[PDB]
Design an enzyme around this catalytic site. Structure first.
Site, PDB file in Angstrom:
ATOM      1  N   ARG A 104      49.292  52.933  32.103  1.00  0.00           N
ATOM      2  CA  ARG A 104      48.778  53.140  30.763  1.00  0.00           C
ATOM      3  C   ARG A 104      49.831  53.793  29.880  1.00  0.00           C
ATOM      4  NH1 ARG A 104      43.312  51.972  31.351  1.00  0.00           N
ATOM      5  NH2 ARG A 104      42.888  52.523  29.166  1.00  0.00           N
ATOM      6  N   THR A 150      33.531  39.475  37.088  1.00  0.00           N
ATOM      7  CA  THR A 150      33.697  39.901  35.698  1.00  0.00           C
ATOM      8  C   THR A 150      33.083  38.957  34.668  1.00  0.00           C
ATOM      9  OG1 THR A 150      35.808  38.777  35.292  1.00  0.00           O
ATOM     10  CG2 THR A 150      35.896  40.921  36.389  1.00  0.00           C
ATOM     11  N   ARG A 204      26.679  47.729  44.624  1.00  0.00           N
ATOM     12  CA  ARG A 204      28.075  48.037  44.356  1.00  0.00           C
ATOM     13  C   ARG A 204      28.168  49.477  43.876  1.00  0.00           C
ATOM     14  NH1 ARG A 204      31.130  47.494  39.443  1.00  0.00           N
ATOM     15  NH2 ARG A 204      33.387  47.594  39.833  1.00  0.00           N
ATOM     16  N   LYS A 236      40.164  42.055  45.654  1.00  0.00           N
ATOM     17  CA  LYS A 236      39.958  41.697  44.259  1.00  0.00           C
ATOM     18  C   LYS A 236      41.208  41.058  43.663  1.00  0.00           C
ATOM     19  CE  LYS A 236      37.841  44.842  41.777  1.00  0.00           C
ATOM     20  NZ  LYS A 236      37.581  46.173  41.162  1.00  0.00           N
TER      21      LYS A 236
END
Lengths: 463, 464, 465, 467
Positions: free
Chosen positions: B73, B278, B32, B220
């Site tokens: 953010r 994850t 990855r 994802k």
């Protein structure tokens, strides 16, 4: 669109090409040559006539030679007159063939009648018409007490229930008949009165000796000894013929049906053809319609899982052969319509079973098989597929022999160069056969990179 | 002899050829490339190194490019110093950078925070640390009410459950990274910020635009919207990455488990590769041994039926990468050891492959040899979790690499397969040559004969 | 609407009747009393409080006594300061307690530390914080090599992976703790560190001596030896508690879940209760929310087929007990919602009848299976097959009424008496209507033992409410 | 060890108590009274004799009354001599009785022969001996063409394949015979020539009207119309009799076989008794042994799953009644010996089904040689019987009629009891009687099936016991 096949005993009334053609059209698949009657010229001409009809019309059929077989029969009587036997009287059988026979005593053809029999055994005469119990055995004589009233005539068949009859596997006439069979190149030999393995082996060696190694031996089970040794007989044979009538005279009446079902089931498991014969549509020898019971027996025999059904006397020397074949075919069709598939085991088993199952999943009306000896087609047939089996082969003998197996349409091709070629050719012939059309899925079974006798490849194609 | 594959995120500590070789030996199957941080020279060198190790050793592996993706953010605060928030008060979000706000109001990096959002929507901050509900929308400001107490920090991530953020799946950096990916000829692209099918399509289009049409897209699933549109995303994608940690921030804890299991099951059904990624062995970033719960989670993830498992941080910038890969591999083997086969409008391919696995299982076949051009057949066979290893023969190197990600399949690049009989011969040869099967073993051989590429219709049993 | 039961360790924050009531409302089913901490007055007060809440509200619950068990611990150090150990050094363990311990050495409480251990064995300290490899054993000393750096402190636990620890089944205080348990009439006894069947026999024999023969013994599997001898322990025990955290420091990490799964599978087959315990929602001791991994762990543990789940520290001395119980109940519900029955294809009559009862119940869409039991066996026998239907357990035995609270999907009900089978059908139908779990028109399967003693279940009857 | 029951038509050869006793010993279970022949005194005497034998021996049996039924028959001929009909000749049927009939024409007894029949239809005469094709219908006459050569005689039966025959459900004699049936308190009534539900209802009402409400009606399916309305007829009836011989002349022959199998199947599902009748062992009227084909037919009929097999003529006026019943019993035993259970595996089924199936399943699982059943009407025993249990069904009842009627159900042994006060009482008494029967022994598992806290017609509890 019937699957169960029909063996038709052909005689003087149905030997002509016209009748044979109509018989084939009616639903006939196999010609039975009953060597209990006739000479070589007749049978030879029937063979020639049938194969010419086959050549001309493009219809497929097989030829089966049924031996007369060895048998124990009574002999001549005084002045050629019948006698009446009474219950409780002392009757005697002698093994002296020079003896002309009266009320008190009669001669038999079998030189081991005294040896094989024991005190207490049952002796049946004229298809179980007259029964007798052995009271004593002295010298060349067998003294018996008559159990029931009846009229004895000349040259009557003799049955010995539960007795091992040391008769040869082949009468001397049978041996010559088999040579005739080899000369004519018949597809099947129905060997009569098979009691044990040695008999079948003898049939096999006799064939082998005259270039009949590729001829399949159908062992006729007719008595208790043969039924007892059925496994070895079946293992040694290429097929079985269930003779109910003889069994009805040889074993308890309530056991015949389970002998039939058992033998049929074991034949199905072994991927070998089985024929249910005798007492089929006998009433149609004189009548234009069969009785209800007959239809019932035949239908149930088909439901048991028979490869083929046999006409004996109805189609040969009967007044209504075409009617018999026709109604037989309707029964076959009606019964076949409602039968379903039956889904350490080896390759062939897993692959063929899986092929049928796969065929069922995809609603495939056809299972095409590449075969050299015919083993794969029978292997697929074992599971009673809803799909018709299209067996492509370069061997005529096996092509002819596959005519006897249930629900298989055999086809002779020039060559199959490879597996992909088999697929191509198979698709082509599948469309050409008219059994399947554009859009239909077809399952294709064959042996890839292996010798004959193994089935290991299965392929699914869309037409 | 594990069946489940291991994806390893490579970094400076594990980019070396020797170390990569060690990682491959440890159980690594896929590399990855986390483009969240790094430059082209490094990643390119990593790729080159891996390919060199592959070339020298003759070992097989795949390369996966993971996009960073866009993010919402918070912005700059007083003096670069920490602050503190209160519950139940009036917090406000404005679409104005120049505006600084410690409490009462705050600015965001996303232009259109005011536009896409609606009254009633929830605003989450810092991985779901602080939650608030939108009270009103006016002009450039949107007033919200704080639902729970928490301390607000500098530049914290923002999650908007069920709200369409209307940003592209790929920023200019992601675009250039993807172009770089096409240039390098990577095998996989793990696309971040997939919310719906259109996002995947855009990735596909960007790829196709640069000769990456054969590159497989791993979508994802990291948010609620992505979970809602999972079916379409899966349909459009070549595979899925189950991002549990990221979902954990958008949905209730009680749903994540079954979301994972459901996505894995549906991926398995569709013959699409799935990755559990994850929160795998995070403790091994710092420690040489994992905790019980982590190993348990991984094992259960494998038991759910995932094709592959990912190390993210353990193998990249962690102190014990090789250990992590090793223990991961042991866990993989241990879990795979006790798993059974899973047999099943029904079409050909389905019936043939299922029947092939069944037949293989019935005859104790240690190998299922498969002929593949696109790799679909091997994956079709894999769908049923065969006890037998899948030996996949192909003339396509890309698929040969890509099949490395699929469970229990050993890819093999061959020069040519001329026919079905030739396939059987070569398959037998390579089956024996591979050492996975020997004389006497039965092998089931699967392929497509006289049919298009994407179709599998033949199954044949042979004795070696 | 949840089937999986919740055991909660009660402490000062949850000792009051109000909190206990709240805990029961939240989903608590069984109270765990950890005798590793507390005195008799306290535990007695907790018991009294629970019994008061039960008496007042009329809800049912069980009381479980968890023993401390024997332990190997290090002892005091120089100046009461932690010491830092380095890897590859020479650390030694001594049997002389009176010894104050430093870097080089510390004393342990167990006098067989030298005997049980062998050269090559691993010695772990403070929940696997510090690992050591035994290099030599001399006299009363065990010389070891430190494998990893760490700070050693006072009174830390010692773990010996794969080593059979010849300690007694019961500590000196535990006998009196069990006696207290018998006096208070506890429903369950959770024995810590069960390593072999004899231990279970010792607890059972001890309880038997003080009128605790009717108390169910739950063996806590916490190490390699207990896991290897699991079958006999299960045969000898009334239930099992899977301590994952304790096993995790004792056995290989990749093996812990399969030990859990294997043990749970066997407990269900044996018709005995199983509890998944340690490392459940510990994070909620300080946080108001659990982690995803924990929720996953609980869900999977429930999916494995556990009867109950346990809180240890979350419910006792944590900052968010009620929240933990609540989310636990939520997880239980969410996980139970998607579980189906297990209808096989040994077994005997009872099995056949109960299996058939579940089969028939599901076949006829019965939402309730009423069972008459004296010992609680039939209910557990029916429970074995994970019925979609709730199990309504009628009993004339208060202890079984208490004990059945731990079994999954079982609602116990104390009845006056059951005079006959028809009477049982009548009463069961009546109570089925009264329970509110079933309504008019609903089919109910009714299972009981006819013309046989209270140890076999042989009758199943279908009724319409 | 046979489970299949045997219905025996009793005649002059088997009317004595001695013969009846031997017949019961041989395997006879039910006495059939064919009211096509005989008077009330005779049948009454037969009933009395059987009941006396039952009283002395303590054996159980049922009494079945078979009606003659309505029929279309030809009438008298010239000089009482047969006439010869040839193929292709124009033959005519007349509705005028007074006409004496020759080669050209004859009268029929049925007045709606002209109405019901149509041009193109087939007319069979004398059990399908002579066939004719209807060419035209005028006035009171039906003009037909003879299809085959044959000799026509006096008073011969007429069959009309595929024709709906507006004959009444009951002839005038049948009604008084049924009244006699009610008087005698017979257990079964076999109704002839049932074509539709209304026929069954009429008989039911006729019985009901004379205190015969507890008598079970067995509908005899003999033609296509009845076969077409088989479901509703079965719904209205308590059982079915498959008359193969009559069917063979009415429908295509290849269809007869599947008609038998289909009807047996539906009867099994409906928990109603079925009897396979006619052309069973007829050859034994003259011979001491049956043919292979006959044995095969009977065996297959049993394998299809018929509750009982019926003798008609073999046991009545034959030279070998004992032989026929004996070999029939042997066939039953041999065939029953190798039959397996048939457990369900039509969308939704209820309680009774689930309980009984589960009971049989559990019985099979535990190698239980006996299943004891508590029944009032016989439904539970028949409900359990549906799955062809290997175990014998011991049916305990307080109903004399049901005890008698269950004798016809396959593999069930009925037992009359005085009272059953409760479920535990049933278990106790059932275990006791289970031991007493000799069918089960100490240690053997027994499944006990009954209805607890429910009205008649419901079975809801099944219990496992060790004797």
């Amino acid at each position: 669109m019937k699957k169960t096949k029909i063996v038709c005993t052909i005689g003087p009334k149905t030997e002509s090409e016209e009748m044979l053609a109509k018989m084939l059209d009616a639903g006939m698949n196999v010609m039975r040559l009953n060597f209990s009657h006739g000479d070589y010229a007749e049978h030879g001409q029937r063979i020639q006539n049938l194969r010419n009809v086959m050549s001309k019309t493009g219809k497929t059929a097989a030829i089966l030679l049924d031996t007369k077989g060895p048998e124990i029969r009574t002999m001549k009587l005084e002045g050629g007159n019948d006698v009446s036997l009474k219950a409780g009287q002392t009757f005697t059988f002698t093994t002296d063939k020079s003896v002309i026979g009266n009320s008190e005593m009669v001669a038999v053809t079998y030189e081991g009648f005294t040896t094989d029999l024991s005190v207490g055994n049952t002796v049946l005469v004229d298809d179980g018409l007259i029964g007798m119990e052995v009271t004593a055995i002295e010298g060349n004589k067998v003294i018996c007490k008559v159990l029931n009233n009846g009229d004895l005539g000349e040259n009557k068949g003799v049955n010995l229930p539960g007795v091992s009859i040391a008769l040869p596997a082949l009468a001397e006439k049978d041996k010559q008949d088999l040579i005739f069979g080899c000369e004519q190149g018949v597809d099947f030999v129905a060997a009569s009165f098979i009691r044990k393995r040695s008999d079948v082996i003898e049939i096999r060696e006799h064939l082998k000796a005259h270039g009949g190694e590729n001829i399949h031996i159908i062992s006729k089970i007719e008595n208790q000894e043969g039924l007892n040794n059925f496994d070895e007989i079946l293992e040694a044979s290429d097929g079985i013929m269930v003779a109910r009538g003889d069994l009805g005279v040889e074993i308890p009446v309530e056991e015949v049906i389970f002998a039939q079902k058992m033998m049929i089931e074991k034949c199905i498991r072994a991927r070998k053809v089985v024929i249910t014969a005798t007492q089929m549509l006998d009433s149609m020898i004189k009548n234009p319609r069969p009785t209800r019971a007959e239809a019932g027996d035949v239908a149930n025999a088909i439901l048991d899982g028979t490869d083929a059904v046999m006409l004996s006397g109805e189609s040969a020397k009967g007044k209504y052969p075409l009617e018999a074949v026709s109604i037989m075919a309707t029964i076959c069709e009606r019964t076949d319509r409602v039968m379903n598939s039956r889904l350490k085991l080896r390759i062939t088993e897993a692959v063929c079973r899986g092929a049928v199952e796969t065929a069922e999943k995809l609603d495939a009306p056809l299972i095409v098989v590449a075969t050299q000896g015919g083993k794969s087609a029978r292997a697929v047939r074992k599971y009673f597929p809803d799909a018709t089996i299209l067996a492509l082969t370069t061997n005529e003998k096996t092509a002819h022999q596959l005519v006897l197996s249930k629900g298989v349409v055999p086809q002779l091709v020039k060559e199959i160069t490879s597996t992909d070629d088999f697929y191509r050719l198979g698709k082509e012939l599948a469309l050409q056969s008219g059994l399947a059309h554009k859009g239909d899925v077809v399952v294709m079974v064959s042996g890839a990179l292996v010798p004959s006798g193994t089935t290991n490849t299965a392929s699914v194609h869309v037409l």
